[PDB]
Amino acid sequence: VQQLHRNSIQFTDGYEVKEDIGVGSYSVCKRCIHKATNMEFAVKIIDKSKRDPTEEIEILLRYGQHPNIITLKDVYDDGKYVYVVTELMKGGELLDKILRQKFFSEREASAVLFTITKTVEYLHAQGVVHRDLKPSNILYVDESGNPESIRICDFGFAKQLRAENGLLMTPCYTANFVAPEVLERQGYDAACDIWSLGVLLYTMLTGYTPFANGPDDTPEEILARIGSGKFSLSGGYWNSVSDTAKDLVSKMLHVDPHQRLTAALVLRHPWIVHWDQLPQYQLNRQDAPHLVKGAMAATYSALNRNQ
Ligand SMILES: *[C@H](c1c(-c2ccc(C)cc2)c2c(N)ncnc2n1CCCO)[C@@H](C#N)C(=O)OC(C)(C)C
Ligand code: NA
């Protein structure tokens, strides 16, 4: 792999390291400054002895050109750590910014889901599944609040479909070859990416998550809700929401992964297609962004205990 950058020169040579902006067990995101131009960037630093970042980086190299995918700017490998330099996101988490907008509308929500689902329809069509589309991994690059500034930002769990050979495959070229039940697994992962977008949508419309009330909810109870197939689309915050939007929600959160909408079908839904008939007036939402952040972290911690 030309992703063998161990031979060139120094990250610390060309950038000034600033503060952490995110932390995990085998990687860290810090903010940084390109010494020569004084321009700001983010840099995920990845421990090579703990994880192999090759698939993330390749995916970023091939698809980072997408207007709604985080854009890779540089990358180093001093041997022990890979330094992945990107554009720095100045708009914060998308869902959080939206929840703190008292007058957010259905029309806005549809444009947001369009932009995001368009992006995942493209990834899926190129054989990529994200596997971890939580709302905290979707950010705004600036504070304009335009859909154009949405970025999906972490591909640390993303998977590119391959044949046994180790050769890259698109869902379209299904001739080979390396297709043993791996078929169904990719098919299920893309369905989980859609589910995650259903969760995002639910929460945008009403200001709460469908399967968790706060960070204190036990993982067992969240899983029971998730597996019950049942969730409320009535009353309170749901009264003021169109029936077209509730319909789309039911189909993106459909408990049956085989009945769950595809990205392609999501974009053919009237709530996405006839945006121009969607109301621009206020939605009636709960106002508890921090509680939601907790419930969201709870929902994914409960799902990701194994993975
Ligand atoms: C990293 C992160 C990034 C970022 C994403 C991807 C790559 C290759 C490099 C950096 C980033 C950017 N570009 N702008 C603003 N904030 C950014 N963060 C921090 C978000 C808050 O934690 C994180 C993400 N996404 C991340 O996942 O960090 C750990 C893996 C948890 C350490
Ligand atoms: Na991009």
Side-chain angles (χ1 to χ4, degrees), residues 9-176 179-180 182-307:
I9 56 88
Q10 297 281 349
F11 173 75
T12 51
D13 283 353
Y15 294 80
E16 199 182 348
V17 178
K18 297 299 167 177
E19 72 275 0
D20 295 5
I21 61 187
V23 183
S25 333
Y26 42 80
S27 64
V28 196
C29 294
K30 295 169 161 301
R31 178 178 69 94
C32 63
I33 308 173
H34 186 262
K35 296 182 179 183
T37 59
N38 289 306
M39 327 211 301
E40 276 179 305
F41 296 101
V43 57
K44 172 165 180 185
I45 298 200
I46 294 161
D47 183 13
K48 265 270 221 48
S49 63
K50 276 191 168 193
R51 189 196 135 201
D52 184 27
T54 300
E55 184 140 34
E56 180 179 1
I57 302 161
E58 293 200 347
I59 282 170
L60 287 184
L61 277 163
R62 166 164 264 243
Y63 306 120
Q65 197 57 6
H66 192 290
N68 298 122
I69 298 201
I70 180 188
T71 299
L72 188 134
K73 293 295 178 181
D74 212 334
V75 43
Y76 305 76
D77 189 320
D78 75 356
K80 342 185 308 163
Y81 300 103
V82 191
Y83 305 77
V84 202
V85 178
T86 71
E87 57 183 338
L88 184 77
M89 307 296 164
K90 299 183 148 192
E93 173 185 320
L94 155 297
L95 177 58
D96 183 88
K97 280 311 185 73
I98 290 173
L99 297 186
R100 294 167 193 271
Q101 276 180 268
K102 204 229 235 81
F103 305 90
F104 190 69
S105 68
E106 269 193 38
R107 184 166 306 192
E108 296 326 282
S110 177
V112 160
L113 190 56
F114 175 76
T115 295
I116 295 168
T117 308
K118 243 315 176 50
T119 301
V120 347
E121 180 200 37
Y122 168 82
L123 295 167
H124 285 175
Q126 307 306 326
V128 182
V129 298
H130 186 297
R131 307 220 278 98
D132 196 35
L133 258 191
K134 41 202 182 63
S136 43
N137 298 345
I138 308 184
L139 315 163
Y140 277 120
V141 73
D142 61 49
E143 295 180 23
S144 78
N146 293 321
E148 281 69 31
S149 59
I150 303 161
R151 300 295 189 275
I152 314 182
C153 286
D154 184 82
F155 288 82
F157 290 99
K159 202 69 155 59
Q160 198 140 202
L161 187 65
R162 277 179 208 271
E164 189 217 16
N165 186 337
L167 183 65
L168 286 64
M169 307 289 287
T170 59
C172 306
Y173 190 60
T174 51
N176 293 29
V182 161
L183 60 106
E184 210 159 329
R185 175 50 43 91
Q186 186 97 347
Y188 159 81
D189 281 351
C192 291
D193 291 355
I194 298 308
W195 181 87
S196 277
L197 292 174
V199 170
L200 179 72
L201 177 64
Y202 194 106
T203 310
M204 277 198 298
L205 293 178
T206 61
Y208 65 105
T209 81
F211 308 106
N213 298 310
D216 292 325
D217 290 11
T218 66
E220 287 87 9
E221 67 180 311
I222 293 182
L223 299 170
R225 295 171 183 146
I226 290 177
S228 85
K230 290 295 185 56
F231 49 90
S232 158
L233 295 172
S234 86
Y237 307 120
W238 281 117
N239 284 356
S240 71
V241 180
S242 55
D243 253 18
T244 164
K246 307 181 187 187
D247 187 55
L248 168 62
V249 170
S250 61
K251 294 164 191 178
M252 305 178 57
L253 288 180
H254 202 303
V255 62
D256 181 359
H258 289 330
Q259 301 232 269
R260 203 171 299 156
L261 241 50
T262 61
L265 294 168
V266 161
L267 297 151
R268 297 227 187 295
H269 196 280
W271 194 78
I272 294 286
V273 175
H274 304 296
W275 56 272
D276 68 296
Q277 306 184 34
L278 300 178
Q280 300 150 284
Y281 60 67
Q282 183 175 12
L283 287 147
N284 179 247
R285 294 188 305 172
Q286 161 184 255
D287 183 32
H290 184 70
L291 183 66
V292 159
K293 177 183 301 298
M296 211 61 92
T299 308
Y300 288 95
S301 170
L303 264 357
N304 286 319
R305 53 201 193 299
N306 302 128
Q307 175 68 206

